[PDB]
Amino acid sequence: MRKIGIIGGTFDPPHYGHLLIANEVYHALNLEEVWFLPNQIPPHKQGRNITSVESRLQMLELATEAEEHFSICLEELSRKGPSYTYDTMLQLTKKYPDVQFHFIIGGDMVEYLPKWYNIEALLDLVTFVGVARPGYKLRTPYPITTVEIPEFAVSSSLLRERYKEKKTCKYLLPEKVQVYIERNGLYE
Amino acid sequence: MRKIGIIGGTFDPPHYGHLLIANEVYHALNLEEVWFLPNQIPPNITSVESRLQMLELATEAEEHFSICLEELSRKGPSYTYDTMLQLTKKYPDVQFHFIIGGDMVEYLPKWYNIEALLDLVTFVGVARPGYKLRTPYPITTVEIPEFAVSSSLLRERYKEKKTCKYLLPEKVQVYIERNGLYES
Ligand SMILES: O=C(CCC(=O)Nc1cccc(Cl)c1)N/N=C/c1c2ccccc2cc2ccccc12
């Protein structure tokens, strides 16, 4: 079976941290490809902004288009509302019978896996890949694959605050995404 | 209504980072107290006995910290919705503030029964100075400096037979090395 990584999130915006993690897992586990899986976001409760599906998808394209081994999976983003990861992976399993899915999660996610919807059934659909800091181990009763990656501290929350302050985020994310964000006045 | 915080996790082991977060939220939102909510771990795992004892030792001297056994009172893991449904039933006079890491926030829409859970708790997202949380849901933000102590860091130090002095309460360290936890 084809070894394919999945990295999910809202990518709001995508940045070098996401690419670094995707790349590290790609090399560490000798994957064929990594699919970025943009999540759906429910409409805001209190008349504030969420970043459109259109904008998030385009930023993601700009962030990944340079890498032949990165692709985008629209399974969640095409639906009307959020999806449980179990339901998504069930659907990807039906659509791609010959793929072994390696589902990337942060080290801090790991202790909370037992609280995921249909976790037991999901374990039969994917191999989890927990990203841990150098030399440190993840503790979980579940079978998981560990990949070591330094914590680089860049986050979407950091970048949004900078854009709110009308600063550049050059060197924290692909040039092309920075250009797109400031041009369309995102995160202001 | 009494304002009470909830901080959940496996606490494996509890450490100054957990206490720092509970304390910051306690002070920021003028809470009555904060309840530590140990999670169940499905079938090496640290025994419930051991995790509870460590939590007890970690919170012994803290006046405004208590332990809530709700999730340990059930056999297997619980969704947070299940837990908060029971706690709201048990404490109708309480406004619960459920503490989550800033990294959790974008994934809230994937939590089981999130819409119904929003009717049961106020979420408190903790964020590093300079970080802005973004979610469609009502949430309260509390600024907390990152501290870089984690249970994973500690477990590895103990496996290497290093001390974790200054990273968690003395009484917890003593319990850990006496009982040989994290030795493997
Ligand atoms: O889809 C996901 C995680 C995807 C992800 O973890 N992607 C990712 C993306 C970039 C880098 C890395 Cl290290 C990981 N599910 N997350 C849900 C989720 C919980 C769901 C139910 C019950 C509890 C949950 C707790 C979570 C805590 C942190 C982060 C996510 C949590």
Swiss-Prot record, chain A:
Keywords, ordered alphabetically: ATP-binding, NAD, Nucleotide-binding, Nucleotidyltransferase, Pyridine nucleotide biosynthesis, Transferase
UniProt-listed Enzyme Commission number(s): 2.7.7.18
InterPro entries noted in UniProt: Cyt_trans-like, NadD/NMNAT, Rossmann-like_a/b/a_fold
Reaction catalyzed: nicotinate beta-D-ribonucleotide + ATP + H(+) = deamido-NAD(+) + diphosphate
GO molecular function: ATP binding; nicotinate-nucleotide adenylyltransferase activity
Matches recorded under Pfam families: CTP_transf_like
Enzyme class, first EC level, given as a word: transferase
Domain of life: Bacteria
Pathway listed: Cofactor biosynthesis; NAD(+) biosynthesis; deamido-NAD(+) from nicotinate D-ribonucleotide: step 1/1
GO biological process, alphabetically ordered: NAD biosynthetic process
Record family assignment: Belongs to the NadD family.
Known role: Catalyzes the reversible adenylation of nicotinate mononucleotide (NaMN) to nicotinic acid adenine dinucleotide (NaAD).
PANTHER family registered for this protein in UniProt: NICOTINATE-NUCLEOTIDE ADENYLYLTRANSFERASE-RELATED, PHOSPHOPANTETHEINE ADENYLYLTRANSFERASE
UniProt-listed HAMAP family: NaMN_adenylyltr
Annotated protein name in UniProt: Probable nicotinate-nucleotide adenylyltransferase
Organism lineage: Bacteria, Bacillati, Bacillota, Bacilli, Bacillales
